[PDB]
Amino acid sequence: NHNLHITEKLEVLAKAYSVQGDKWRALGYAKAINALKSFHKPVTSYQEACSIPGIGKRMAEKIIEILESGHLRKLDHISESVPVLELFSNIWGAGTKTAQMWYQQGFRSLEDIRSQASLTTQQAIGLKHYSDFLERMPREEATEIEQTVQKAAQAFNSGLLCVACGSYRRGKATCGDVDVLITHPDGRSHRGIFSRLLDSLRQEGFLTDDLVKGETKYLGVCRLPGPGRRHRRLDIIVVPYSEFACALLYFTGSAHFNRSMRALAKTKGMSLSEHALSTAVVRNTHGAKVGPGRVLPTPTEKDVFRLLGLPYREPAERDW
DNA sequence: CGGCAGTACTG
DNA sequence: CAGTACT
DNA sequence: GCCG
Ligand SMILES: [Mn+2]
Ligand SMILES: [Mn+2]
Ligand SMILES: [Mn+2]
Ligand SMILES: [Mn+2]
Ligand code: NA
Ligand code: NA
Ligand code: NA
């Protein structure tokens, strides 16, 4: 990154807007920061600032105040609430609205939350694992978690296919959680497995707490056996084989990669989700879907790229 | 002016 | 439904 | 915040 001296300061304001609930302004900052981190050379002119997609007049002005003065005075007017709102919204299950409500009610520390706040079931689990959930794990440990789920799944049906997606599949050295996708090539035997699979993982002691238990999605907490182990977040999705390619693409990410690709599809009158790539989709003047269109056959990830007119990218080049 | 991705849970 | 979460 |  040629522009750490710029992006380091803009990241502060981006995080401030985000925890205060100003999601679209934070998005614009997030995109500009990416754009700046991907420029070869230092940005050296307001004229050169507007040069870059994602950088407008306002952002170019901020970047020159930085280069001219080495500082951005807006940083000096960030609300004193922001560090506390960040502290609170790092509880899993608590977002901007809950953080702001706790702040208005007078809470300032996790001790205040522990002793006085009303917590949902999810948020109490988040708070108990507050430190662990902020830690990333070595990818070697993500491998061990993937293999634990796979062995429990294969015990029921040898045919079950299990793959760790997310940051793991994109090749990152550390992983925030493990994202495991499960399917069955026979198109049928993925059905109703969560019952037995989660109970198998729970009877082990591996699965320690459940956050979301849906028909297709599980989000929870696991811990490998032995000393020196931390609790780790584990996400599992079970999908029919016909949706494997789109589910794999979705679950491998990155999030910004997915959003960019789905935006591309929309410009082309198509729609991309974890279920399918569809064409001939009818939308209104607000970009909202009002006609469903037709599902396109996508037996592999490469087919999704091809149908969108894009060169294929391996998971490691999706790490946007 | 107004979209900025598309979807799944929880309560 | 609003809120939060996933990539 | 940016952009069509
Ligand atoms: Mn992940
Ligand atoms: Mn995850
Ligand atoms: Mn722990
Ligand atoms: Mn993530
Ligand atoms: Na630009
Ligand atoms: Na949170
Ligand atoms: Na009090």
Side-chain angles (χ1 to χ4, degrees), chain A residues 194 197-198 200-202 204-210:
Chain A
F194 256 131
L197 171 63
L198 298 175
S200 179
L201 293 170
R202 214 181 272 124
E204 277 192 52
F206 177 69
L207 221 59
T208 66
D209 260 319
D210 306 331

Side-chain angles (χ1 to χ4, degrees), chain A residues 49-51 53-56:
Chain A
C50 317
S51 83
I55 306 282

Side-chain angles (χ1 to χ4, degrees), chain A residues 34 38 211 231 255 287 295:
Chain A
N34 287 349
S38 300
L211 298 164
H231 291 85
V295 170

